[model samples]
Target: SPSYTVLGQLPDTDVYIDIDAYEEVKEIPGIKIFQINAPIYYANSDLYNIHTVILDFTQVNFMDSVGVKTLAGIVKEYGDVGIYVYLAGCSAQVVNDLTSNRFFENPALKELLFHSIHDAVLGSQVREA
Candidate 1:
């Protein structure tokens, strides 16, 4: 495979979005989205200062049973550090899969679900204000 970008920071924003790819690499992108507890060496020093992240699951049709566990954990993982992670453009099937796997068992994670990329991005900013 070619060197494709799986993560991208939204223009003029701290939010990072994922590029289309198989669920195989979803876990890394999740960590790469926000890798750490230190004040330095956090992914990219230039864009280290972030408070929100959006994972684009629009192109993703199938999410493995184990994958939902990682997905659920990633959300809580980011939440633990004061960073918010949102899911954008997720299909009904994906949502059901996640639900069946207890992704939203805690309820708080439900708010992170968005209708689309724009909704997540703009919606997150609205919360800041």
Candidate 2:
């Protein structure tokens, strides 16, 4: 075999998630559209100072089997600190996997589930008034 070398940025899939806070949402203090590129799992279900981290399920590519406990726990954590939490663009599986365990029924793991991101964002803003 001929000598060959490849050196560049390697893809790291270590429970890492891409997070971004929308500037528009940031304009209002204590409210933000917390953008996560993947479903909340034990791998990345970690955070604090989580103020109104509105999680949208639109592009969470890793929705296959994110542990239900971690999923519900993280959502509850937001409410624990009195931070608003909501789900946007959630699909059938995403809702089933999370609620099949009756996490939302616990009344402790309360989080808003909206049909679309628009309702998740703008809808709440209107209600805040």
Candidate 3:
């Protein structure tokens, strides 16, 4: 299995995350945890002024409990910054797990914004009221 890199950044007013679908998870290790957390931290630090974060999960094939927690943390940080965080391209399993687990209901991370990558990319151009 080849290694995968998850890319994230804020381009102009929007933030984007791309998890390489072709990338492989050689083994279930702590590195996945690191990848998940590092991106959130990097985005928070690098794009503090961004109005929205469009997390592209199209390439992400797998996630665990820890990854879910990392997402919760990210949402919390975004809330503090008064920014909107969007979840996109999530697999069915990923979406189910997050919704079923009530990840959206998390107190510290409740104000998340979700959409499909296609829609988000297009919607980014429209200024929201």
Candidate 4:
């Protein structure tokens, strides 16, 4: 019953399907600091809520193609709902998964892609409300 990726963890097991994943959804007004602590994929992407949403990949490692596609879909859906999505605090690996290739087809999200939480903040306003 162990997990696996869209491809691996122990060979032929869905190791990337980290069902043990968890995230903290905090609605800080317009900000949702969704502190995700495991790989994001189809199994869990459904639980995420977008609101200038803050997905912290500080502890995550990788995301599969569907996870990749789903992220952009969710973000765009957020925008259509009039919510600004902010995907920040991803690791360098996470950044590469996003920006180094097709993931950038998503324009708004690509712009929101930040190197660090601090860097993300430098370009946005953080306030208490």
Candidate 5:
């Protein structure tokens, strides 16, 4: 099972959006979009600092406009706060939608900073001066 761990001052603000359905149920297909929305709602609330959102799409089979909007809204809302939204192991379709729909156009989002699962996990720590 894939898991996530945060390393920074924003630990309390870190949100992990798990796209893996198998981790929860053994037989059901993981393409359900509702699961994705729950986390989005949670992140949107003022419950946490929400400095970063790590999307684990290693097992996600599909995503649509709703999913995209959910994520984009979060990033847009927190972008000015230096909040870093990271994505890993996304499917080709998800990648296409994200990049093509101009989600990367936001300078505050730092689209280039998004990384593959391997890079996200093993990459060097980033520090802001």
Candidate 6:
């Protein structure tokens, strides 16, 4: 089965939010981090009680047509609900594909891209403050 988890709090300490239950383990105010341990594919589009999302791409190396299609839909759906999604830890190849495929056509989408998870978290916190 495909599994996923959420991380929160200080960058050092991690919190495990079980995907089955699909809610924060604690009252993680402001932002939530969802890390996929593989390349971009379909994901749960359900919203949470948070303002921002850090979509971790550290483990992702490649993304194909279906990848971008699903990703664009997810991001747009999240935005429709007032939740902001940020992309982080994306590799050069993945970023290149996203850009060339017009993923960044949306200015707000491109603005949310960060180089690392830590940066995305901190940036979102700062924006919310």
Best by lDDT: 6
For 13-117, candidate 5 gives per-residue lDDT tens digits of 232333342233221121111222233434335224333444555555555566567778765665556655566666677667766766767654444344453
* Cα lDDT, all candidates: 0.59, 0.51, 0.50, 0.53, 0.45, 0.71
Better of 4 and 6 by TM-score: 6
Work out how many backbone clashes candidate 1 has: 0
Flag clash pairs in model 6. Answer: none
Name the regions of candidate 5 deviating beyond 4 angstroms: 1-51, 106-115, 121-124, 127-129
For model 1, what is the error of residue 124's alpha carbon versus the real structure, in angstroms, after optimal superposition? 1.1
Across 1-129, the per-residue lDDT of candidate 6 in tens digits comes to 243456654424443333445333442577777877644554553332778878888778888877787788788888888888898888899988888788988766777788886677667765642
* Model 3 spans with C-alpha error above 4 angstroms: 1-48, 106-115, 122-129
TM per candidate comes to 0.63, 0.58, 0.52, 0.60, 0.49, 0.74
Candidate 1 C-alpha lDDT tens digits along 1-129: 121134555555544544353332332222233222221122123332667776666666756667677666667777888878887777898888888888878887788888866567666665641
RMSD of each: 9.8, 11.1, 10.0, 10.4, 10.0, 4.5
User: Candidate 2 or 4, higher TM-score?
Assistant: 4
Off by over 4 Å in 1: 1-48
Clashes of each: 0, 0, 0, 9, 0, 0
Pairs of residues at least 3 apart in sequence or in different chains that clash in candidate 2: none
Selected candidate, larger lDDT, 2 vs 4:
4
Candidate 4 least-lDDT 10 residues: 1-10
Better of 3 and 5 by TM-score: 3
